[PDB]
Amino acid sequence: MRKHPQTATKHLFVSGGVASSLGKGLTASSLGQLLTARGLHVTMQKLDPYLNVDPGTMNPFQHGEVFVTEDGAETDLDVGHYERFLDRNLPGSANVTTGQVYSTVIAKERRGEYLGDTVQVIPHITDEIKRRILAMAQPDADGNRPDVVITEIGGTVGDIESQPFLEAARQVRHYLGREDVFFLHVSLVPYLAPSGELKTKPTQHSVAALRSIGITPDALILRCDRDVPEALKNKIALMCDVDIDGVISTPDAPSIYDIPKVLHREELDAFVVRRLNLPFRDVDWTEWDDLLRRVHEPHETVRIALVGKYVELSDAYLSVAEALRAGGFKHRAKVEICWVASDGCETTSGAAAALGDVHGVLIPGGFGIRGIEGKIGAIAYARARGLPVLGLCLGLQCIVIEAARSVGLTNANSAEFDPDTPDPVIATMGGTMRLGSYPAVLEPDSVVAQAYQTTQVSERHRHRYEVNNAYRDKIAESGLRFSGTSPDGHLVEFVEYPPDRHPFVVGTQAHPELKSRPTRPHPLFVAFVGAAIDYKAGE
Amino acid sequence: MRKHPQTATKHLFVSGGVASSLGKGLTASSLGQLLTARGLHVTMQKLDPYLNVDPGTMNPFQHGEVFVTEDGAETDLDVGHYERFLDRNLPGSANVTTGQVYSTVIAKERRGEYLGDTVQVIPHITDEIKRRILAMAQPDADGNRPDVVITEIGGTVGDIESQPFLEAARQVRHYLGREDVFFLHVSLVPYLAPSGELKTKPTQHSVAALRSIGITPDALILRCDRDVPEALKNKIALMCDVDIDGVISTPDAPSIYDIPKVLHREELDAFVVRRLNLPFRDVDWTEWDDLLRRVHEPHETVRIALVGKYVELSDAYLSVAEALRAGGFKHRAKVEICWVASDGCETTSGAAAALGDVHGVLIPGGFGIRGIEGKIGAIAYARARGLPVLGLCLGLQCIVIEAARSVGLTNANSAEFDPDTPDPVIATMGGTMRLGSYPAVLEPDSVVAQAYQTTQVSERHRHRYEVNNAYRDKIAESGLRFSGTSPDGHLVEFVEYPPDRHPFVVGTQAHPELKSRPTRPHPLFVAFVGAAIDYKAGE
Amino acid sequence: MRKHPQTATKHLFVSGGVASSLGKGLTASSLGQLLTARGLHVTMQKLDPYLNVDPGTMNPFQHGEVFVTEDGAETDLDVGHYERFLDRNLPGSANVTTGQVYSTVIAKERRGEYLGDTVQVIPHITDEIKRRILAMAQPDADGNRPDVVITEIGGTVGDIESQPFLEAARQVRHYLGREDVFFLHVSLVPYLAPSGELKTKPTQHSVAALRSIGITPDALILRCDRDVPEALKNKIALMCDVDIDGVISTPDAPSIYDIPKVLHREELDAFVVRRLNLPFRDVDWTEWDDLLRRVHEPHETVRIALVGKYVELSDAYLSVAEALRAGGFKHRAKVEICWVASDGCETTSGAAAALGDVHGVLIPGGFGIRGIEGKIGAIAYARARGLPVLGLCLGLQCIVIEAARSVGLTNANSAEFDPDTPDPVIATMGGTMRLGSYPAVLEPDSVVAQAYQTTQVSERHRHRYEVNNAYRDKIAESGLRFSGTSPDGHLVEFVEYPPDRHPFVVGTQAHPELKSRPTRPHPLFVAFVGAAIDYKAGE
Numbered sequence A, B, C: 001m002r003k004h005p006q007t008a009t010k011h012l013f014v015s016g017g018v019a020s021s022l023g024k025g026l027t028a029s030s031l032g033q034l035l036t037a038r039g040l041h042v043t044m045q046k047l048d049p050y051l052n053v054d055p056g057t058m059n060p061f062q063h064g065e066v067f068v069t070e071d072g073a074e075t076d077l078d079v080g081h082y083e084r085f086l087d088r089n090l091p092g093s094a095n096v097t098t099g100q101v102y103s104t105v106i107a108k109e110r111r112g113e114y115l116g117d118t119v120q121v122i123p124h125i126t127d128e129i130k131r132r133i134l135a136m137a138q139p140d141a142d143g144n145r146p147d148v149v150i151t152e153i154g155g156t157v158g159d160i161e162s163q164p165f166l167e168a169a170r171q172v173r174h175y176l177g178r179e180d181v182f183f184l185h186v187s188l189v190p191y192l193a194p195s196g197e198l199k200t201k202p203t204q205h206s207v208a209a210l211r212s213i214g215i216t217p218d219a220l221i222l223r224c225d226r227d228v229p230e231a232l233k234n235k236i237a238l239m240c241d242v243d244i245d246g247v248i249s250t251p252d253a254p255s256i257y258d259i260p261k262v263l264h265r266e267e268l269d270a271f272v273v274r275r276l277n278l279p280f281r282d283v284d285w286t287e288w289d290d291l292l293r294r295v296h297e298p299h300e301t302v303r304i305a306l307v308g309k310y311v312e313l314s315d316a317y318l319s320v321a322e323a324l325r326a327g328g329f330k331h332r333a334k335v336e337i338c339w340v341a342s343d344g345c346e347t348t349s350g351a352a353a354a355l356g357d358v359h360g361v362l363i364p365g366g367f368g369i370r371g372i373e374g375k376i377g378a379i380a381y382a383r384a385r386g387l388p389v390l391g392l393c394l395g396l397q398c399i400v401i402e403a404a405r406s407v408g409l410t411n412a413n414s415a416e417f418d419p420d421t422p423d424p425v426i427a428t429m430g431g432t433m434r435l436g437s438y439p440a441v442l443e444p445d446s447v448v449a450q451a452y453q454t455t456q457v458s459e460r461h462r463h464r465y466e467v468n469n470a471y472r473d474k475i476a477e478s479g480l481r482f483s484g485t486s487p488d489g490h491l492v493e494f495v496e497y498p499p500d501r502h503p504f505v506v507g508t509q510a511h512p513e514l515k516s517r518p519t520r521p522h523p524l525f526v527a528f529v530g531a532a533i534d535y536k537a538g539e
């Protein structure tokens, strides 16, 4: 029955081998999904081996886009998968880093809190990490105690930087015993085309590397481009001393939302539940079956251009692409994304050549970005052509600069992008970096208000430049409306053209893609995809 | 009660760290002693990492003396400790080697028994080793099934040659689970005189090396020259993730027979019994208490010279020294051994300077030996001085050569030591190497028969040269009696002088020290020590 | 080693079948002694099914003598065995009774503490009993937490009164699980002389009765008059579903102090330790071997008369008889007890016929007693004959009455025994019943002080009549000395004659037999037995 006796909090560690980008985080999120559907209170955590105290200092070419929490911490991309699959808001405590651990221990040492002992990597650093892991088990603010804690160990087994985290995980297995701690290992099975064979040796070497630090995997996730033969799974199970139930073939699925089905079909969740002795019930597939219908059987299709610098074959825009697809799901339309380089759109002819075939354009935000002349050029072309545009953060800034160049302000720019501009229509109000959720008020019956169907909203922000209030009355002559603001009205939060000027061209300073979920699409992307559909139908 | 239900055969693996010669084999033998006294049927086994198919090819400077079994196998020194402490005769199967394992697997490959598979170090070699380990568990020829199998892994953790044996032990722990397999780890705690501190770092590194291959020790034997402080044991337990019950301080005992008392006092046997869940009863200390009384509280003392080449600070004569001490124990006399170089006895003045203070001389056997001129010189001096002499193998050969040089045969020698001798009184009957137990018949009322108190005996042999039957009648004029022979009389097995010629001077081709036990002293050494006592008392 | 990790407190329940007086309490005490010698902190408890709130109201024909604790509670006889074998002082909480439990629950009900529930035998009464059982596990006043709690369930399985206690034991086994709770069942194997066969059927029916309430015994103690054959143990093990290791033959030992040896020889303690998974070490038999030497190999012998009413084949004087034998042990003399009826000593000829062969006389205390004319007659005869006398409680009262009748007070008596006496030399100071330990001061160099070798003592008291202070100066003319008193001198605590009047005639109001232990004999009994030995030697 729905009510069960109390049991200790189970720890499930996910680790990676051979390489990064194996979908380790997505596999952990999908397992969290399945365990949630079986009725368990899953909570999740990530451990980042890098020394950056937070990824805000990084460049999106390193590990993709940054993410932001409601308590305002700045965290790795994987916390976004955790949100999108658990449909939850996670604390900043959900992302530990070596930078934070070392800073904490060094500070504690300077204060003498170790009573004159020699501070060492073992026990003190591993103790801090073990403390940070077991803190997840404590009852939440409302007393709800997690049934399973899924911890993802970033990096690769054998990286020098992972050594303290894996030692902490080993000590947790020692303290709590095997009945509470489960190790899931994700590994790569490469295909060599010239000889037409899958090779298990990389997996064997990775499992041996893991054993060399005192960890025995309970299951293996064999990432591959094609379904692994049964003979190879038997060979791997034999060589790696893993139960043949625990070798899980995980081929590249057409979309990330099929992964829960793949793992359920292989009975990974059943294996984990049996091994950890958790109480369970069957998965109610109703919701996710509807989602997968919206994914695989859409009624129509639409093409959207994604314009950026990182677009050169990188997942720097993962949240934006997923929010776009969720918007398509709300309308049961397939959204096809055309990855367009910003710099090909600097010339009007180049912009026409790039964009002429699409049904909409998206200008996402970024940091360390350059060359926004191409972005604004794409805006100018799209407005003339009638394509819908959604601008996120920098997209709104480029929209405002386009409007500035529409009314007389030809040399106008951001102080970020031309410090010598005579018309800094975008300027520092380095100023206060706005981070996290803030409330905003919307113009009644604005296109933004028509989308949200409310006058009050809250959105996650990450930026420090703002619209210069000195130019509102000048740029309003473009027809642009400051249709959403901070509650005091001091800060512009949304801009749009009236529908009769262009059917839909909207920008927002915030990152709404960080509040979207596939089963709860965000209003603005529903609106943007609807406008793109209307363009395609009317064109 | 004495009768208990059936349980699976428990495996206890003993491994070493830091260095060899830590007393790993003696600790295993003492634990076998304690578990036997608690009523369990202990059996024992050794795994030798070296590639020699058997140590017969080695030189006693490498690892000490060789040992011989009743089925006639030639084995490491440690099987001698197993015999002396369990008072048992062990099969040749009790000593596995890498040489045997590789030869077996290669032979099986040549015969195609692996059906075309690639032969690998894993699984095939480790499977052969695991098979050889689990074969010890099978019921004996009488159906007696061992309760515990104690396996000693020779070498050091981290030697390249030990890698297959430790992997086999790990696989045994995997197959049988933790409730059946127990790992005991012996390690060194060095004392640094300049700073006056015991150092635990070598132990930490050894335990880490052991963990790096997938073995977690259940207990630590801390070998030291002085009793380890409690703070250091706590530090070791904390750093090594070992139960504080499992850190066992094992300081250098004055004699090897005190080790069972040291281990019992530390409750190692209790810890092992609890952890393996074995049925037990208290140790009946009656017998071993009597032995230790004979050891520590003797009524008198006697000095015996041990003459050899390996005597330069090496345990090449361990069995001989222990048989001497057992002979002393039968008479409750302390036997003090003066280690005398053979080459200082070549000159009569040098022999007098070396031996003049002793009460008896022992000439042990050997192989690859040279310089027996000094040995025979010691015999000549001792006979003139009246000291008792016992000659083992080569000791008998030197006695016979001395007698040859006593009757006319001044240039007589062994064909081994002067191939050009005109009088090869010792000669090949390379001839048949006699190995193991053979029966012999003794002259009635011979000194040998007076010692054994029987006319028939069996002794372990290891030699290929024999007394040349052509010279019996010539050398008998020395007064020497061929007082023991093979049953057909063809081979001389013992020689002695009549008591009125010298009170006791006896030699035997066999190695009686391989049938002695501390609680069952061998007749000949009882006789030899009694003669030395008589000399000391009469002198 | 001596220091082990923490483990949960183990509960061991001792229950009885077929009949009472099977030595269930003595077996529990012996097991406690063994577990203490193996190094465990044993604590003990008894549950009495009878409704009497304490045994003070009972008659010594029911269950033998009453016992007293230092906090002054009045408890069953078995607490005396627990003291004598553990050599400890136990709280009054060590004796629960149905009277106390029902009174407690009824009182709580009247105060509404059950919040309107229907009060039932299950849960509420069994909950109170389980609470009182688990309270023994709590850390003591110094933080020492017991390792094993041994609980004796009084009565017999299948008595109506035992049903709540056995249900509480079943609930304890449910709560703590089988790894913590062990059931020891004591049962009788009768011998039928006409057919010469031991019968196991009573044991089978008792074990079946026990199983019918949900308890499966882990071991059986087969009480018998002769050693049980092995075939019967096999039959019992098979029929009763008890491990053949757990059927323990426990024949009637010549003295109660052999029982630890019997249980150890049968390996009951080993079985319990293995089954509960307790950490242990071997029993150090030094002390108890010395005790058993004093028991079985005395140098001499002496006969002592025990004069009382309950002497008609009853154990109403167990503590006194054991204290006598402990006194004998201090001197290495065998003490033989001649059980003498008081009423045969009323006439001087009858007293002579009863006592003439003994070497000393003991007058023990009692309650509900009558006919003290015979007791005083034995005192008068013994004093004339010169036999030494020790008088306990009523013995002191009779001594004082004898002295009263020695000086002029022929009609003197206690107000208890002649309410109309004209000379109540013993009188209520019903008055305050003095119970438990009280301090006393002794005359310097008194015979009592010569025994105790001190001027200050404390003794356990149970009485309400006292020496009437009005008669001290009158009765002192007998020669009697009030050689010990309360610190204020108000109360007489010891009386004696000077050695030249009689070599030893002493009485005390207290029960020194309740402070004696077999390994710590009490001064007064050592003195009394020494005086009896001196009489025997001089007579």
Ligand SMILES: O=P(O)(O)Oc1cc[n+]([C@@H]2O[C@H](COP(=O)(O)OP(=O)(O)OP(=O)(O)O)[C@@H](O)[C@H]2O)c(O)n1
Binding pocket: A016, A019, A020, A021, A024, A025, A048, A049, A050, A063, A078, A153, A154, A155, A156, A159, A161, A162
């Ligand atoms: O992705 P997550 O979820 O595991 O989060 C991750 C991924 C990676 N890392 C660390 O960054 C460094 C380089 O990583 P990196 O894999 O990219 O190696 P590289 O030199 O760049 O070779 P390659 O061409 O294969 O990229 C390594 O020290 C990693 O331990 C962290 O801390 N968290």
Ligand SMILES: O=P(O)(O)Oc1cc[n+]([C@@H]2O[C@H](COP(=O)(O)OP(=O)(O)OP(=O)(O)O)[C@@H](O)[C@H]2O)c(O)n1
Binding pocket: B016, B019, B020, B021, B024, B025, B048, B049, B050, B063, B078, B153, B154, B155, B156, B159, B161, B162
């Ligand atoms: O004694 P056991 O019972 O363990 O039986 C033993 C002892 C040693 N071994 C092997 O012989 C080689 C050298 O041994 P070795 O310790 O002597 O090293 P080394 O180079 O000589 O340095 P060191 O000066 O310290 O002697 C090593 O490969 C060992 O694995 C074996 O097979 N059985």
Ligand SMILES: O=P(O)(O)Oc1cc[n+]([C@@H]2O[C@H](COP(=O)(O)OP(=O)(O)OP(=O)(O)O)[C@@H](O)[C@H]2O)c(O)n1
Binding pocket: C198, C199, C200, C201
């Ligand atoms: O003798 P009768 O005249 O009454 O005739 C008897 C005696 C006994 N029985 C039955 O045989 C079984 C074992 O009997 P049994 O008493 O011997 O028990 P057990 O297991 O052997 O224990 P143990 O012998 O030690 O007491 C029982 O089922 C009895 O009901 C019968 O049918 N007739």
Ligand SMILES: Nc1ncnc2c1ncn2[C@@H]1O[C@H](COP(=O)(O)OP(=O)(O)O)[C@@H](O)[C@H]1O
Binding pocket: A016, A020, A021, A022, A023, A024, A025, A026, A027, A078, A081, A250, A251, A252, A253, A254, A255, A256, A259, A315, A318
């Ligand atoms: N099983 C899969 N099938 C198809 N695509 C996938 C799968 N797993 C992951 N991906 C994609 O590959 C990328 C790597 O996944 P990711 O979550 O980042 O793992 P990691 O934490 O190691 O970096 C993601 O962008 C994800 O969308």
Ligand SMILES: Nc1ncnc2c1ncn2[C@@H]1O[C@H](COP(=O)(O)OP(=O)(O)O)[C@@H](O)[C@H]1O
Binding pocket: B016, B020, B021, B022, B023, B024, B025, B026, B027, B078, B081, B250, B251, B252, B253, B254, B255, B256, B259, B315, B318
């Ligand atoms: N605990 C000890 N105390 C004193 N002497 C010892 C002790 N242990 C071993 N020895 C001696 O040191 C030598 C090494 O012991 P050994 O049995 O050969 O161990 P290993 O198998 O590693 O070679 C032996 O000759 C033994 O007599």
Ligand SMILES: Nc1ncnc2c1ncn2[C@@H]1O[C@H](COP(=O)(O)OP(=O)(O)O)[C@@H](O)[C@H]1O
Binding pocket: C016, C020, C021, C022, C023, C024, C025, C026, C027, C078, C081, C250, C251, C252, C253, C254, C255, C256, C259, C315, C318
């Ligand atoms: N195993 C025994 N051998 C000899 N005498 C015994 C034995 N056990 C008990 N007794 C004696 O029998 C009497 C009854 O034993 P007891 O401890 O009181 O059991 P219970 O608690 O049921 O009353 C005791 O006085 C004791 O001295």
Ligand SMILES: [Mg+2]
Binding pocket: A020, A021, A063
């Ligand atoms: Mg990644």
Ligand SMILES: [Mg+2]
Binding pocket: A062
């Ligand atoms: Mg990288």
Ligand SMILES: [Mg+2]
Binding pocket: B020, B021, B063
């Ligand atoms: Mg060695």
Ligand SMILES: [Mg+2]
Binding pocket: B062
């Ligand atoms: Mg060496």
Ligand SMILES: [Mg+2]
Binding pocket: C020, C021, C063
């Ligand atoms: Mg009783």
Ligand SMILES: [Mg+2]
Binding pocket: C062
């Ligand atoms: Mg009764």
